[PDB]
Assembly symmetry: D2
Homo-oligomer: 257 residues x 4
Amino acid sequence: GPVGYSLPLSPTGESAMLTPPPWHFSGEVVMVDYRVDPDAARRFLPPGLEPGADPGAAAAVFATWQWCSQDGAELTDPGRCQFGEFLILLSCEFEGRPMARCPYAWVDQAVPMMRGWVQGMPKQFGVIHQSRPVTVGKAGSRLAPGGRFDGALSVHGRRVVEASVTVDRSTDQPPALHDVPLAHTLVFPEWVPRPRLVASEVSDVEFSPIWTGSGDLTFFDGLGDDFGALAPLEVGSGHVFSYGETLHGGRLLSDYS
Amino acid sequence: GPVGYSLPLSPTGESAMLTPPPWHFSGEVVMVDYRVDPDAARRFLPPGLEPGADPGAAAAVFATWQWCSQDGAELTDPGRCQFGEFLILLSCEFEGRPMARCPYAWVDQAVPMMRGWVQGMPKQFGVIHQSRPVTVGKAGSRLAPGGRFDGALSVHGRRVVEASVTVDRSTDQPPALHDVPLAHTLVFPEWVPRPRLVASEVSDVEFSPIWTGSGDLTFFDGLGDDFGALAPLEVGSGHVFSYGETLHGGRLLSDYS
Amino acid sequence: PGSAGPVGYSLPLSPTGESAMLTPPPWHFSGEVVMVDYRVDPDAARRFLPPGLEPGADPGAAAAVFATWQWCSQDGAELTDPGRCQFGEFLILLSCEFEGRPMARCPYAWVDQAVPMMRGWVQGMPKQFGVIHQSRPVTVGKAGSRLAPGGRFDGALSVHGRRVVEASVTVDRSTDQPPALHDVPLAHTLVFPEWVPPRPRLVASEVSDVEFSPIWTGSGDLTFFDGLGDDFGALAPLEVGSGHVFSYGETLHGGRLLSDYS
Amino acid sequence: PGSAGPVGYSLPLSPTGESAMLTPPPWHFSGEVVMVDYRVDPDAARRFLPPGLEPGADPGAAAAVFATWQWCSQDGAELTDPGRCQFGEFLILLSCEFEGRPMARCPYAWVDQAVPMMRGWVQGMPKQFGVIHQSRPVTVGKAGSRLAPGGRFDGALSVHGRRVVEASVTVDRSTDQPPALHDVPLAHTLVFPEWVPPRPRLVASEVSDVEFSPIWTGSGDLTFFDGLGDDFGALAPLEVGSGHVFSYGETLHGGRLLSDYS
Ligand SMILES: *[C@H](/C=C/c1c[nH]cn1)C(=O)O
Ligand SMILES: *[C@H](/C=C/c1c[nH]cn1)C(=O)O
Ligand SMILES: *[C@H](/C=C/c1c[nH]cn1)C(=O)O
Ligand SMILES: *[C@H](/C=C/c1c[nH]cn1)C(=O)O
């Protein structure tokens, strides 16, 4: 019968929407660290994920990505291999080890959206915009002191997050929540009448120099009270950097059995 | 911990991208019946699904839908509750009973796309356009003899299906492939190192009068040789009609155990 | 007859004229409308009326109009490509008069397709780009409303990712009385920026073959939100009146000069 | 000083002028370009040149240009809204001359945002709407190419859901020599359809502060596909030459009249 890594199945397996991992990612990031209500954050952590050594540490992350499979085939079609993303990260721990939980994410392309659910990453669809550094002319900011970079997310036609960073210095210190494993919940609805906690296994994690400065972050109404509970109490430092990793598959943290 | 019918999980369950069934659908359809190579069609049928009593009977279906949950809440936001769809149907049988297999489908909204995979319906993302009947003025066709209606699908910026119907008469005879159960394969990729054949359980199936006439259908390159194998050998009658159903959940046809 | 360079009704010019983005008029329109009548600050509305246009007989009468359209040129060629011949629109209409005759001024319009947007500027309709959603009546199933008493229909406009207008109509009854602001000539201002170091003209859109379906009428609701600036906000509803759901057709031929201010 | 009705640099007019879709120039541009030089049928190209523009010193020189831009007005206000200040573009350029001076003619352009599209017509650039994709260089990870020898960069244009141009560049070396067609004035035709029963003008875009990054150059590949008509197809490549990847900036001030054909 027909085969494939994913739907649609086909006689050769070529029609599948998704390709098997590993997948490579190369992205540009605009990120703001912030303080979240720790009691709100705790309510987004499933069993096994405990509050972070700093329970109120969170981050808002805008990124633009290119991705490809092991053969690099997608790279020659920029429309296929590019997407934009916004996500929230919360600090947590699993068996005493620091991790990050992503309670919310949005992307602007279908393949990444579905692939997110494969990994347990709770992606929905949104419109996501992000400033890009310039090196010539006057219509933008250089990656240099005083450079400003903005991000915005709209969902169903309503503007729900805006962030800004004005950088003042370069460092070699990766932002903490972007340098720990992500712990996701793998679950799909049961169509015919069992969640698993998993971590994304990565290799070849790489950061550019990190441009850091002031951060600004505002949440707006339009995603509901549960999301609103994660709005910043205080906003910290911003960071602008490039990031790469290879995603291989999942490792089980717990199946609650 | 956080809950929900689907991701993202949240403390109240309100953040979930998908709502539990049942879901109601009301749609406008432009459909063309056609002859497919039966040996090509057979290769898209998984174990348990056997060739149709007429193995070469296929259909190309364009539809525009409104949908909602049991509470009707989505109806007040037309941007949330509308989508367009194109799908291929193939005639098959399960345990001697006529059914339809959908080997390929595309939609233009994220919620329906994900919900399709919940049901085993192999939806990907596309750009889908469809003529609408008019009742005033000159810029369109009436639902009346001589009225013409067109459909088009583009995927990743390449035009891959065009269809047309010019209607000549109204009937009370629902198109055969739109009036049998759909048999889907429920399978998700395994992220941490088992397909099921299921049928969609529906109620309250309703057709408007069926406007029927000549059909035209062309496939173009741009989805690969596996899809191309289902191109029409001959094109039959076209149909333009409205359709409603309520989708409740899945029933297991086989888990291959 | 004695033409040299490339030609065309509009840019881009080409040797045959076939490449032009726009076709010459007339253009035919067939649409579905969800409209809400409302009361505007008359003094605010007046400031949007150029010289030559006087306040309407009822200076506070305004309307918010959602429509989805199919259009084509005389030859009908666009109809076979639904992606090319369809667009959604949201308009504000204000009541006014030219030399004693009732007309409507459209101070703001949005559409979701490029050809209509540019063609709007040709006619003086001040179209910008937006995301526009509108309920459609259904006739089978449960996922929507029928054109019948109790039927509800909604419209929403977002611009640059910010929700700026929402309207709703719940219809009670059918009538043969077209809504006043949808049944009078539109008076636009033709002006285009001058690139080489503008002379506006007041024009009316000349139409024929205007046609309405029966009008379904009932309660209206309308809300403006922030995100288009204070000039737009000045036209927000003081009070909201009746809503209407109907189909509309017309043929647009060209402009008739009301004043060139000579 | 003595102004009555509503005002604005462009439609829509408003009491303060704040609602206008377009801002007055100058406008600043900062972009990333993927460009392929190619050989065009010179006789085909000539038919796209209006009176006053002569064939280029090399009449068969043409280029296909993909660019992604950020832009802003003098005050920089648009930069804080990336959705408002970014757009993608695809252009064809043809070599020509005005009174002995090298210039470039743009017979066709597409963009993916409404403000740039309309602003194009203000300047005479014949912009239509399309879907435009372009590779970006990466500096970390494996999912892309570096600006370095061996780096590959692709561009694609689709119009009305049909793929019409694809280009690729694989760079070998860096130079300080800007590609010829990207380093000469653009000569456009200003014309807008007449609504009330056109006078074209040949203009050059006046720019300052033109700036290039180092130019990465290598092999070029370019393919045109059906779906924009035979007039466009006449400009398809006979031969394809070098490709170039670079960053570009300029400030656009207004038009300079080359001929009003008086
Ligand atoms: C979704 C997200 C991938 C990712 C990796 N880091 C951050 N986001 C996908 O495309 O699989
Ligand atoms: C996807 C498809 C639903 C459907 C029902 N009939 C045809 N397509 C979804 O929205 O769940
Ligand atoms: C723009 C708008 C046309 C129109 C006619 N009635 C309402 N709107 C266009 O497409 O020309
Ligand atoms: C349209 C195009 C501007 C431009 C400048 N160089 C290349 N394209 C606009 O946004 O005005």
